[PDB]
From a paper:
Acyl-CoA:diacylglycerol acyltransferase 1 (DGAT1) is one of two enzymes known to catalyze TG synthesis in humans. It esterifies diacylglycerol (DAG) with acyl-CoA to generate TGs at the endoplasmic reticulum (ER). DGAT1 belongs to the family of membrane-bound O-acyltransferases (MBOAT), with members in all kingdoms of life. Each enzyme has a catalytic center with evolutionarily conserved histidine and asparagine (aspartate for HHAT) residues that are embedded deeply within the ER membrane.
The resulting DGAT1 cryo-EM dimer map resolved overall at ~3.2 Å resolution and was very similar to the structure of apo DGAT1 (0.73 Å RMSD of 406 aligned residues). The structure contains an additional density corresponding to one T863 molecule bound to each DGAT1 protomer. The positioning of T863 in acyl-CoA binding tunnel is consistent with previous results showing that the drug competes with the acyl-CoA substrate for enzyme binding. Furthermore, the bulky region (7,7-dimethyl-7H-pyrimido(4,5-b)oxazin-4-amine) that links to the cyclohexylbenzene moiety interacts with the catalytic residues His415 and Asn378 through hydrophobic interactions. While the overall structure of DGAT1 appears unaltered by T863 binding, a few residues at the drug-binding pocket, including Phe408 and Asn465 had subtle conformation changes, orienting them toward the T863 molecule.
Numbering used by the authors:
A (entry chain B), B (entry chain A): 66 to 228, 239 to 481
Write the structure that this text describes.
Amino acid sequence: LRCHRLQDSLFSSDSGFSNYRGILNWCVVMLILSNARLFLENLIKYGILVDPIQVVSLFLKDPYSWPAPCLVIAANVFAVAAFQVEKRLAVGALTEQAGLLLHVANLATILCFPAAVVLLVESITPVGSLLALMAHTILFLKLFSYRDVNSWCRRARAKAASAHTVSYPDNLTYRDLYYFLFAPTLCYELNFPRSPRIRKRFLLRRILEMLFFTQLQVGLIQQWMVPTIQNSMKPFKDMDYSRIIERLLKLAVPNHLIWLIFFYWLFHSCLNAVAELMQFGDREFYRDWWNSESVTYFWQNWNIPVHKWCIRHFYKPMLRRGSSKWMARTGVFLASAFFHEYLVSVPLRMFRLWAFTGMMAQIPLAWFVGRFFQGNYGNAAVWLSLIIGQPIAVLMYVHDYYVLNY
Amino acid sequence: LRCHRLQDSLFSSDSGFSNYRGILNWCVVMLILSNARLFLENLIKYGILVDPIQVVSLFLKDPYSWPAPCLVIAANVFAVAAFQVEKRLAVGALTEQAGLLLHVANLATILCFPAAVVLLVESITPVGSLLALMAHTILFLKLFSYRDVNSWCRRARAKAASAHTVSYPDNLTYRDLYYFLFAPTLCYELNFPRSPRIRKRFLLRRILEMLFFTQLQVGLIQQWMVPTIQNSMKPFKDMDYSRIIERLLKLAVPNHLIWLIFFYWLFHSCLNAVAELMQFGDREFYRDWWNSESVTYFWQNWNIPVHKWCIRHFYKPMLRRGSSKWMARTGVFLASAFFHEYLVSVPLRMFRLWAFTGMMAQIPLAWFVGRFFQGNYGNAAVWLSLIIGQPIAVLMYVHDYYVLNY
Ligand SMILES: CC1(C)Oc2ncnc(N)c2N=C1c1ccc([C@H]2CC[C@H](CC(=O)O)CC2)cc1
Ligand SMILES: CC1(C)Oc2ncnc(N)c2N=C1c1ccc([C@H]2CC[C@H](CC(=O)O)CC2)cc1
């Protein structure tokens, strides 16, 4: 017969192969070969400690020497307040308008309370402040979704009244609320899927991944970025465009590797360990944002929880009350910009309005990268826009904070 | 409806996603970001030269001061000798037994001639010697396939005699032979496929890839391996197991990166530029050997030309004359081991019999990695066996040559 068809090479720009589940394993085996000795040593060095019980005792002993773990616990009063308004509204008291009013007040409190606490307390640490604010914004989004879902189901029951799974009002229990609050999802939904069992092997591999990547990220920072920042210490507040760009083009690639490591550390190790502990079963926190040949396709697959929340609690609910689809999309982007700014600035007390500018510039950049570049070159443009792009904003914040405190 | 299915994360060991055509583009864009400045500078520095015409004149002026380009040209007498025996055999003279005899003599000459020339001439360079021997072994394999194919087609015509495409005897022209000799394939076949046209853009990108990766590989060698070899210079001939392993475990990873760079440089840039110049259309010189969860699956997809030659001129032709399938497979491995040894040793005049040992150890290693490791862990085992594995043999050869001549 024949032995020579007419085909193309697999790496060729037009073959359509896309089966590279051996390049990720190559990255894994090379990372292990390079850092396994140090990881084993550091694990034996920092595993002999009894951190959890000693630290929780040292904290409960003095509930004023750690204000961030105090705010994390104080958010429970907002959780319980939302639950109480919801239960009263389900029984019948506090008619719909009053219920919406109370929930708006409670959510505005969830936001503007820890901002004031970390802006009017000087004994608090930036990392602790950031974790407090992140717990509170996650609680805010979760409670917004809780309110929306219970509103929908209650109005559905009321409409039906004029004529194993769980119906509307029988879900309002504290066990339900506190399984939802700790679940790896910002989208509330009755009858969350479940997994069969715990899979100890899986949880062990995930915790190993968390520890290994923590060590890797600390090494990256303390051996590639701190030395580079200390090479020429001048805050980005005053430097002109030339100098700020010349500094960022040297600080960008280590920043990008830290970003990728942190993506894998959170969105696949932390969330998967959580969702495995308490069987959650969805376990789809990202999609192929890496082979994303457009900016608008990157944001749809990066950080799936926040994105599906944005969709079905801010974009579709605003298209229902038809509001100029373009305007509602701009509103989605505006809310996300505000939240990125509020997360990065307030812990550092800075108000340069930079992460806001990045998230807003994501619109013209989307138009640009869509109209000009296409295919694999569009993908390379998206990667370039992630190397400098938006993460450089958080880099600028942390750098100008480190250059003024050490 | 629902918004939470029951799925798994894409990186999860059991999701079956395998669509990472964004990690290769990440590697590409990072390589460019890291080396584009130097590449542009070096290209402007070494593009002003007039290398081809000046060097070919300097050579034709003195056909004894460059014996490797003399052997490369002298192999044409073997090409023409095979063609002449074939044409006489097609017309009718030199009956089949005599024709097989003459071809065996001509092939044994193709092999044992340049070995003697590079072993009895001291004015020859190791790289030039290697390219001469590689041209001659490629010519040997191509002529073996030429003989086999014409034998098959001639016997087919003879059998049929007792009863646009190209028939058997009308292909024997010099244009056919010399399009086959320069084609990116060791497998002869009448009516090779063709491509529509030249695609100047494609050829330009391929030449750019060749130049960029040449610069990258030179940088790798001269800044990661020469310094490491010069850290402790002792040839592998005498050192015990402990010291040789301790040296190779420091020299292995740079060697592996050079290996990957050279794979992409040859099997996708050089061969594709060739097959694009002279429209060849097959352009399938490798397959997904990277996501190969077994050793026996790696060799079936690494270096497709040599492998399909091995199959349909040494394995199936030996199963036809049924010879204990296991024995024929061992014979395939033995021939490949001999050719790797003959390619790496003779240019360096060494005879340590190391690449032979590697290619032979590929059998028990195949059994091992197949029986023990499975799935993504089998793939990680294959990657580990490529980091130390067989390429360490060529590394040992080149190192023991460099440690005794500089
Ligand atoms: C910018 C925003 C909010 O912030 C994110 N913050 C963190 N993680 C994410 N994943 C984010 N995603 C986001 C986001 C959300 C929705 C959209 C869609 C795109 C599609 C069009 C319709 C259309 O024109 O086809 C409707 C609106 C785009 C971006
Ligand atoms: C080792 C050898 C010759 O050297 C190579 N040298 C360079 N590049 C390659 N690509 C090579 N490939 C090779 C080679 C060829 C054929 C085989 C097959 C495997 C399959 C079994 C049947 C079975 O047991 O399923 C039949 C024999 C294996 C390896």
